[PDB]
Amino acid sequence: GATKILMDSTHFNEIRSIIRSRSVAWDALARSEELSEIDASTAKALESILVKKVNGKTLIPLIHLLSTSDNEDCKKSVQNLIAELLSSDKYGDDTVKFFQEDPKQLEQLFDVSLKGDFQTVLISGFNVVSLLVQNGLHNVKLVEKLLKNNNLINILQNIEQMDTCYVCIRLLQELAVIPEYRDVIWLHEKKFMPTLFKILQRATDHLGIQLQYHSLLLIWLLTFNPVFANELVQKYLSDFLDLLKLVKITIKEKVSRLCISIILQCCSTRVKQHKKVIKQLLLLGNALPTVQSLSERKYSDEELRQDISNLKEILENEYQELTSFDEYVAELDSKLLCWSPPHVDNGFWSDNIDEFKKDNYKIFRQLIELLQAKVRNGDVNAKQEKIIIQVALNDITHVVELLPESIDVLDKTGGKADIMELLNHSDSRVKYEALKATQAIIGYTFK
16 A cells, blocks of 8 residues: 554554543534534544545644644544544545645644643654655654654653553654664664663563564664664663573564674674674673574574574684784773783783783773772772772783883873872782782882
């Protein structure tokens, strides 16, 4: 036909049912002078036609009313009838045309749309979108608008009401289908994105298995642009890496796929310096193991295995090209210094030193910053906070003894000192590391 979105949605269909339940007595309303027959009569008529008329001079009054009205329960049944048309197998075909020809009508409806009772807002949305993504009704400004509209966004944010939240998302996602829209949307990822993920932890541990998907999908869609992909990954990282978690724990295979895919999309030849990404997956999210395990399994859905198989390869290769230093960075970058062979490996040090003495030892300074942070930042001795330190005093030390000329930067940055007081500690290892870190410098402070 001409696009009847959300046709299988049972929870929508269900929401729909709770709205058409509340009946309106036009006539009376008319008669009571609460409406204008014209309208009132026109709807009362439609209402039957639908629930028991080409479409042309039917809307106009509706909208009118819609616009001109204070009967929240009225506009509802209307907003709805509007919807009922849109999907009506019979109508809903011309319904579009109506706007196809008067794309402002759509502008107008739009104003009367998205308001009041949570449902009113939905169907309204529902309707409005049904059109926005229409044959040739594309109208980002509107999208742009609804994207910033509250009422609906709010609906979308509250995860507690799955049915709705659910819908919204599906709406949003239907728009994302519209390449053009894609930019607008992403532009406000800040509103749906978070939600999407909250929706994913919850999952990570049919309706709730649709939401998951739909949200993926929405993602997967936009993600399609190297940059967008670029962005997500290095902004919604933590969660990113999580996909896997669900990727794992999950079934049906309609989700995984999405995950797996998103993931790849994000390592696509196209995402700039996917490399990091691969690194990250491998490095920061244990992609590998995780994938290896999936790689071999029950995937009635071929392509699924495929994709999985494919991911497998990527990871694997990049892996080989893995130097211990990377690991180094990973911890440094991620701000999580550990205790790992390389750390205490003069050899690791003996080869990756230069790397610290880079662009003005960026890396070192980096190293240093971090340490500096932990000190004030939070100012906690909780194992963690308390570890990074030594680890830092440690790496720092090494660098120190190796590149004696590194002392300056130390001097400049402040750590040089920072350390010194670090000796006045609570935890041995810390003052200690710091100590071992200071007796080192001591040697290079003179002649």
